[PDB]
Amino acid sequence: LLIDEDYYARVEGREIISNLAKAAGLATMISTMRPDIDNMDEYVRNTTARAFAVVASALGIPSLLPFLKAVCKSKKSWQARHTGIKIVQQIAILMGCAILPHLRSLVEIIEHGLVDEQQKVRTISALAIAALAEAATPYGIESFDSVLKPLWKGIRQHRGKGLAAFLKAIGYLIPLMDAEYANYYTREVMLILIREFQSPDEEMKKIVLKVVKQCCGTDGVEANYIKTEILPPFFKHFWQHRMALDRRNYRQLVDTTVELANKVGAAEIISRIVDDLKDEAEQYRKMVMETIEKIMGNLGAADIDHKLEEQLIDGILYAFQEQTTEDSVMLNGFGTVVNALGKRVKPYLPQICGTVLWRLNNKSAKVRQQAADLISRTAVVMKTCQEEKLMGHLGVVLYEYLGEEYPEVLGSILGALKAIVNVIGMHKMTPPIKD
Amino acid sequence: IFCRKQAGVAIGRLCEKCDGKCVICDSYVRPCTLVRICDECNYGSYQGRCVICGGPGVSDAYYCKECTIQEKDRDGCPKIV
Amino acid sequence: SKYIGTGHADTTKWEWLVNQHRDSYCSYMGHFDLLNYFAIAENESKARVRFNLMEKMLQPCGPPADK
Amino acid sequence: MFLYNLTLQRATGISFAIHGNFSGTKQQEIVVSRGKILELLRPDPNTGKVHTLLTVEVFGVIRSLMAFRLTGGTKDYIVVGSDSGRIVILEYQPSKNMFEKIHQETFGKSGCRRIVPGQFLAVDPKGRAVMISAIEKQKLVYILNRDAAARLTISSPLEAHKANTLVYHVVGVDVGFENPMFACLEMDYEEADNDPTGEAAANTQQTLTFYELDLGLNHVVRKYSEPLEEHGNFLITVPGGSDGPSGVLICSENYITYKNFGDQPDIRCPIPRRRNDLDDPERGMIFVCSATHKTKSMFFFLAQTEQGDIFKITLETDEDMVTEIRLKYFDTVPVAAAMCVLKTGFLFVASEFGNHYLYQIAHLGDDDEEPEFSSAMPLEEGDTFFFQPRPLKNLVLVDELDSLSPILFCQIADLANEDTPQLYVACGRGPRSSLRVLRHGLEVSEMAVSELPGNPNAVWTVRRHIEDEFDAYIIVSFVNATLVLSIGETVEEVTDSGFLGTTPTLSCSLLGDDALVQVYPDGIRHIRADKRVNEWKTPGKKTIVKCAVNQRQVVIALTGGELVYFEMDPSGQLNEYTERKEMSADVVCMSLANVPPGEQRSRFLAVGLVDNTVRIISLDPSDCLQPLSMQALPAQPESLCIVEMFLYLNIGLQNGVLLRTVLDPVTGDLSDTRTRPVKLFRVRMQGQEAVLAMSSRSWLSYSYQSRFHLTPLSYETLEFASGFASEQCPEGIVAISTNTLRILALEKLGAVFNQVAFPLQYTPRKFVIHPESNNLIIIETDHNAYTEATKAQRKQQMAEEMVEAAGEDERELAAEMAAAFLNENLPESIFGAPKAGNGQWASVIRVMNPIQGNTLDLVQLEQNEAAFSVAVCRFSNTGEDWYVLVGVAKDLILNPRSVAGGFVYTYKLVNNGEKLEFLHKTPVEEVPAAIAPFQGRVLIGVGKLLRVYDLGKKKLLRKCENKHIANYISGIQTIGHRVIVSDVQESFIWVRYKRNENQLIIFADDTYPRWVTTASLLDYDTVAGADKFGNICVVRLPPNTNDEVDKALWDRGLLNGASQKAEVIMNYHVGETVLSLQKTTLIPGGSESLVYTTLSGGIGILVPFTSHEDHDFFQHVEMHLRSEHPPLCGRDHLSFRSYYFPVKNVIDGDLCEQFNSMEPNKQKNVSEELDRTPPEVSKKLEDIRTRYAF
Ligand SMILES: [Zn+2]
Ligand SMILES: [Zn+2]
């Protein structure tokens, strides 16, 4: 039950096990669960580790602390040490910020495992450090002093998934630190990170991307350092068309880039990708457009100058024209960029409304619905730009399209008409109200 | 017919058929205070369900202005059993 | 019905007034200025007044009547 | 009739006090509960003062208050249990200076209910969980945690309910990092409900209950329950875990018991009584408050007894368990509602009534000669511990906070011959009681005052150095003379360094860091620190008339507007520019803008002529000698100035009106405030630039909470003033009155009311004002007390008892300790009144002068006599003698009520209102609780009897009587023939008295049971009154009621009363109990308004609305601020003002004045529906406060 996909199944399993632990006592739990500590099957050991974590949640961490002290240093087998460190990881994952009073004790109990001869023990130790750090966020950095030198040395030797686990632990440790040590440490790890940027294995690339998102979001890592040292290889190696075909990599790179623009400045990130708005790969266009949407929705357009404005206009025009699918991302992106530019999109508004009218005359009604939705989204800025004649012409074409048989497109057309009436007014409206 | 247990942090929901209705007095005039429900009524497969029919919830349930004026929002979980 | 202090058609005078007195004592201990008034009338600390009202909560109207 | 409520001074009594890092910094701050107002205070560790950082009116009764800190966090949140039925977790934001509602969990109905929680509140010491709890049946536990974003997450409430159980006090247990445990004192009243013998109440013992909360198992379990040997009042959490042993400290009657489960026996230590105490031996001591101190190594507890003695409690463990409890006498402070020991050795004693105090912990009391009481030493279980209470050794008093709680009577009267009336308010309880005179304005403390010959007309404070704030040579000049004084360490009248010298100077301003341009009528000289007197000749033969001199510019205007301007040259030469064009007339007022050292020159300059026309232009060289904006004021501007920060230009006219406008190149929003012509000057109050205007009434435009308040000052009416700095006055005003130079400094920042307190001896019930001598005839009555004669004779009896209770050899030591006990006198205001006895009383009468502090006459009454009413009157049978009639209850026991009779003393008020002579004493059967003059005779309320009395020779002659009053007369009002009588439970009763036939005919009443404290009269038909529960009602007789009414068996009223009923036209719940109402006018030239004073220390006012449109506007403002700005405790404001009776015909301006403290986007969002700018809404809100009393 403790590994079932249903979340409520796992909650009820943990509750039953904890009630069992509090009814029977710690003694019979250790005596009962010890013969399976060094079992050959990995899933029995995983179940026992989760069970021991819930037992620790029931009876308190100090009650189970000496058992972990004995098991994690067992001379007889690496399996017992692996299970104890996994118990510590599951304790962290299960209890969250409640582990903080005994976080120092847990780190001291498991810290020796980082220099163990067995690779799996090192990996589970790094993962347990990462879980304890995540649970302790944003407190408890002092309790990690004694773990700082092993991991930092370990990444200068280990490769592969072990190195990935060590770097993940480091990436979860950095946001807990003060400005000076965060600066020092992220300068120390950026070389290994940028080296791992070109790794072919996808799990490593996801983990390093997560780590760069974490470290760039930490106070003390200055914007100029990220500008000069982090941004060129990041944009050169991660923003390629191969990674855009998997959803997880897509989403993770988008959120990481938005957090980067959140810290180093909107224009600094936006200027490096606007031209990719005109790539022939439509999926790449969608990715870059979504990235620009999130970045500009957080910070606005006050940071964008004239040249980058024209670059953005040309890119969104090309992306909207070479559209073959009814992407809601293109609609929302066009709408938010134009509405964020405000009165600054005024010189570009003729060709834009031309393209909307172009999409308003598309043979397939869903494109027309998208164009009408764009009209509704941008009517206010088009009003404050004072181009009421094109708006009146748009109202005339929509009124000519009012005999549309498909209801959702017709509803969008009516919404566009409501937008046009709200911006031009009732006296100068074309067609007349009486018609 | 009302559960009337001690409500918690769970937010009551309404289905598409009763969107905007007041769960106590059935009035559609002036919603006011967000509905809270007990934890048992939101446990497991019950999360997000309509506080009147148990069907899928699409909007937040509200007490009307008249009910909050009369402090009928302080009587416990209004999930109909 | 489950709320303490409510009543019914068989409520006796003693129970009704015991409910009234207990409600009133809790109200005095809630409303700071009522207890302030009461602590100015006698020459007792507010803590002493609170203690006295709490000791009065056990039987505010005395023992009940038979039948 | 529509009214408007305002609060001139908020409530000052403190219900609860907690300490913690609410600002998130290392310094500790105090959160105090003023009832319906939550305040954050900052005790300064350097100067020892207390600064009120924030006051928020929460519009609800705060029944509990406790702070918690999460594990690893560095900020403290405030958990508030209120009468709203919701538990509110708040966090102080120091950036915005406001409280943010982090959490608001709804669990029950609103009100101080018996089972809805909010009364009792407990936290876990690790901050894991809190427990709110009611008096009865209901305890809720909220588990608190954090997400990854370092916010606060509150769980669903876990019910730990137990029906038929009373909760005395709840507190958390410092168990450490284990499961959070809550400690309760509980009573099981179910056995005493069904026991008619009453034996169950004599055996219903208290239970110490330990509720454990398993966080993983997510439920509350009743882990432990133990009986107690005696009923305790509250509990102290022992700091446990690794800090020390866990467990609780039960405070009880004459005992404190450390209690903990496991292998820990309960350790019992008796509370030490005072050695040779003057209280009754039947009484017992309970701890009223406690304040634990979790230090780095060893903890201790500061527990204050009922008398006021603080005890330092330590626990000698020698294991995880505790072997001994050691108490030790610390000091003696007044009785505290809450005590807060702070870091760096402070202690904030928040007294329950009267002024609060902040002491500095000097010593701890370890290596001294005082005995330390221990629970391990043997006792015979019949003798307690005795200590000798000495004055303050381990505490040094460093601050007090003036609190008006409780206000027992008030009167608004111009007893001092001034223009505005003063607030004469009887305050305090018992020996700490006093009478406080309250005046509008900040207190001004003199620093140095000197006399100079000749009346000055133009004086200035000039410094030779800009960096040196002290004036090196202040030019205190006159119209014809110049008595300029140089000020270094001391002021000496020397004018050698000045350019004017013996010649008079109309202006002397600092034109540079080392140079000053003085424009005397002889000429304008830019004299430096040396003798560089360059007397530059002005354009024309005219003298200096108007001067607009800043730190980087100087404009001298002669007659005809000869605006000779000059900028800041780098050389420093006295030169006049060629742009000297004659205007239409000379400027009566001439001023420049701010000239800081960062800016090269100012940005504005204003010149206003005496023909009621002003101009404002830019001070830059691009707009020289050319006006930009004009102002056609109806009066000639006598002075003008500009104050930075949101800068504002203030122009004072020739009359006492100052118009303030916003800083702009054009004329801003002009708001006129009333304030001799307004010779406005600038000053630097608390670093902030402000303006001080001298007129017939002075004014000082202070900035308290960034508000423009034109509060006056309590100082002499000076003819002129300027800013100055000295050692005694670091930021003060050097001012010149009529031939009197002075230096004045202010201490309090806001200071809406300045108080002077004359001490008393007992609790003052009422006082009246003698209309001839203008004195106060105070009655002071205290329950549970001894008169001074009886206290002295009881001390003598105690000495005579102990000298024979020794009863052995060598009694020289006993006789000398009896003499040492007899001759001493511990102060009653400091050590408490050592007085006891449930039936005992102590009452005095004091004729006192309201101006000074002298008590003209003091009549001490008997032991069991208690004055409850007092009045002054003339008589028809007697001549112009003023008779003081004092009603006294004899041997009144309050609970249960059993009065042994009553008396009315009469005094003739001899020696012109300065002495009382005992003429006679008329006995009555009930308490004469209300005495009022009536048409040359007097009205006395003897219980439920309304008696018209006339003064006789040896007694008082009862000339008429009515006995249709319901329960008990508490107040009698009189206007014309009608007599308005207040019942103790019923409403006001109207009595028509006919002089013919001698009949008191009741003709009207009101249909609501109101526990009326006091009443007031508005006109012939309308009566205002208050409530014992904190309400104010206003009732009015309907029109065409026949007042000439006259068997009684056939004729009946409407509902068990009169045939005519009085309709209620106003009802409003203040939230704090009102004991005085008066229809007065606080400022001259305003309009009449109904002032009320409350028992929590607050003074408010009710203002009639003069138009329909103002009432509609303020109604819409109150409606919008009810919704878009909800109160902080989650209480509905409309339901709070409709607490006992619904709100009617008032608009609560306490909520409407939170519009200015609301967020500016929310401000314009509220104001856009009113079709007005938020400056216009703030202008109307200030106009309703200034066109009436402030
Ligand atoms: Zn429910
Ligand atoms: Zn439904």
Ligand SMILES: [Zn+2]
């Ligand atoms: Zn309703």
